[PDB]
């Protein structure tokens, strides 16, 4: 509880479809982007945390809640764009006479700040008297001991909770989701999604000299001008699809009804025909 682990993963493919065929996870409340539509979404920095709590305390893992474990043991900020996964672990985390291998903090002066782990254990002296490493009436121990017995109903049984801190900051992603690796595109317009970056335009080859550390490529603005192939390392510029304006040449409805269209910005290829300047 107070020593929740953190095993961050990076540079790997995360297929969340495996979690469905596992043990029943009737706690999949994705406080974030989307519970189902998650495989078609890459991540940059995913932090996987884990801890074991009771049953009636799982509702405090949501971003923003009161209680005892959501204020002094493990508190989440009101910006968490991720998912929480919990399941009944009363089959292997609850033994005879109670499993005392889980300790939770009970006495803490101030509220726990976002993403803080209190691994220290000092004698909680609640003021008004100088205490020492002993136990008395006004001086007690901050950490407590959980009693996980199989004779408890829904609410007092152990529940292994594991969350995924999806940062998703603007940066070259490392943890992409599972998707069918399709082929390349010729001088046509597509909806490519190269390494998280989801743009649209003509993917034509270029003659730029990218550096070994460079992945993306921009221009005088924030537009992704060029990019390198993830599995080919080729410099291909990303030019947007052909667009323009439409001007209707009308000689007047009182005279006739024939019109003429002026596709300004086209070379008579992406549309008699007469190319003007």
């Amino acid at each position: 509880v107070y020593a929740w682990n953190r095993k961050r993963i990076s540079n790997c493919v995360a297929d969340y479809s495996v979690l469905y065929n596992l043990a029943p996870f009737f706690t999949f409340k994705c406080y974030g982007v989307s519970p189902t539509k998650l495989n078609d979404l890459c991540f940059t920095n995913v932090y996987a945390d884990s801890f074991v709590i009771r049953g009636d305390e799982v509702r405090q893992i949501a971003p923003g809640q009161t209680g005892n474990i959501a204020d002094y043991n493990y508190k989440l900020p009101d910006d968490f764009t991720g998912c929480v996964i919990a399941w009944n672990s009363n089959k292997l985390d609850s033994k005879v006479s109670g499993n005392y291998n889980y300790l939770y903090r009970l006495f803490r002066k101030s509220n726990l700040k976002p993403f803080e782990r209190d691994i220290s254990t000092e004698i909680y002296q609640a003021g008004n008297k100088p205490c020492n490493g002993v136990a008395g009436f006004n001086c007690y121990f901050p950490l407590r001991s959980y009693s996980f017995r199989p004779t408890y109903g829904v609410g007092h049984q152990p529940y292994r909770v594991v969350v995924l801190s999806f940062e998703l900051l603007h940066a070259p992603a490392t943890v992409c989701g599972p998707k069918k690796s399709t082929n390349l595109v010729k001088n046509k317009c597509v909806n490519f999604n190269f390494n998280g970056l989801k743009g649209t335009g003509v993917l034509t080859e270029s003659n730029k000299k990218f550096l070994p550390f460079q992945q993306f490529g921009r221009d005088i603005a924030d537009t992704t001008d060029a990019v390198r192939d993830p599995q080919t390392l080729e410099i291909l510029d990303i030019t947007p699809c052909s667009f323009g304006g439409v001007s209707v040449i009308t000689p007047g409805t009182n005279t006739s009804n024939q019109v003429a269209v002026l596709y300004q910005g086209v070379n008579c290829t992406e549309v008699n025909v007469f190319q003007t300047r």
């Epitope: 089959k91 033994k95 006479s97 004779t151």
Partner: antibody, heavy 119, light 108 residues
Framework: QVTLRESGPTLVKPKQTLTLTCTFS??????????VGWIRQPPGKALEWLAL???????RYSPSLKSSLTITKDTSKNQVVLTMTNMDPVDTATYYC????????????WGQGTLVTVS | ALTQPASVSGSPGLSITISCTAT?????????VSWYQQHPGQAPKLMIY???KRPSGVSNRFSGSKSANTASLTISGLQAEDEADYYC?????????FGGGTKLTVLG
């Protein structure tokens, strides 16, 4: 598969310390949720649990008998040994050691039976 | 603990039920309950655990349920090779109870 065999002296003097063992083979005791226990079955009576060990050196015993039941694990040679003192001529029964795979599967695989008469 | 009927009789072909009562049931919700079968001279083998399901290797003759707090073992199609003792077992607050005994005597 799981083979739970017992051994030890069947006939013993009264008021002594039993050394009934349980040699398990076919699985590892270090699995999360595993453990080997002991169940007594008197002739013409019902079952009764005596002791149970786990994968974290925890030794759980019956609340009625705690001053004599002393179980120990020997995974180094895969032989669970049970020791009990103050043997009275009422404990004569066929003992069984079964593996507790998990909480839902309470002692799926059992032993074979060793009658330990106390007279 | 758990109390079970001492003597239960059953005609060959009919079906009989057992009673696994509360008897100061400190088990709580009584979620997990397993039934065993022990023939005279052999070791007790698991017949049905988690009465909502059945283990592999057991025919459909054995089935169980628990209405409110009492587990029942419904054994249909009695045969000569069925006279054995059955036990219901659960998890108590400080031990693992195995209940009482139930001897089946198939007459005829």
């Amino acid at each position: 598969q799981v083979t739970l065999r017992e051994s030890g002296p069947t006939l013993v003097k009264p008021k002594q310390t039993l050394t009934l063992t349980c040699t398990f083979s076919g699985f590892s005791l270090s699995t999360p949720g595993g453990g080997v226990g002991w169940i007594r079955q008197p002739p013409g009576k019902a079952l009764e649990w005596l002791a149970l060990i786990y994968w974290d050196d925890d030794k759980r015993y019956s609340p009625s008998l705690k001053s004599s039941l002393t179980i120990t694990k020997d995974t180094s040679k895969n032989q669970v040994v049970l020791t009990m003192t103050n043997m009275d001529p009422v404990d004569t029964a066929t003992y069984y050691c079964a593996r507790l795979t998990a909480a839902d599967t309470i002692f799926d695989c059992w032993g074979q039976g060793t009658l330990v008469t106390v007279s | 603990a758990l109390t079970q009927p001492a003597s239960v009789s059953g005609s060959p072909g009919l079906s009989i039920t057992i009673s696994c009562t509360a008897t100061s049931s400190d088990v709580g919700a009584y979620n997990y309950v397993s039934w065993y079968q022990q023939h005279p001279g052999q070791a007790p083998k698991l017949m049905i655990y988690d009465v909502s399901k059945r283990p592999s290797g057991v025919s459909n003759r054995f089935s169980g349920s628990k209405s409110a707090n009492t587990a029942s073992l419904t054994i249909s199609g009695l045969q000569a090779e069925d006279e054995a003792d059955y036990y219901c077992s659960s998890y108590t607050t400080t031990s693992v109870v195995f209940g009482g005994g139930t001897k089946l005597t198939v007459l005829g």
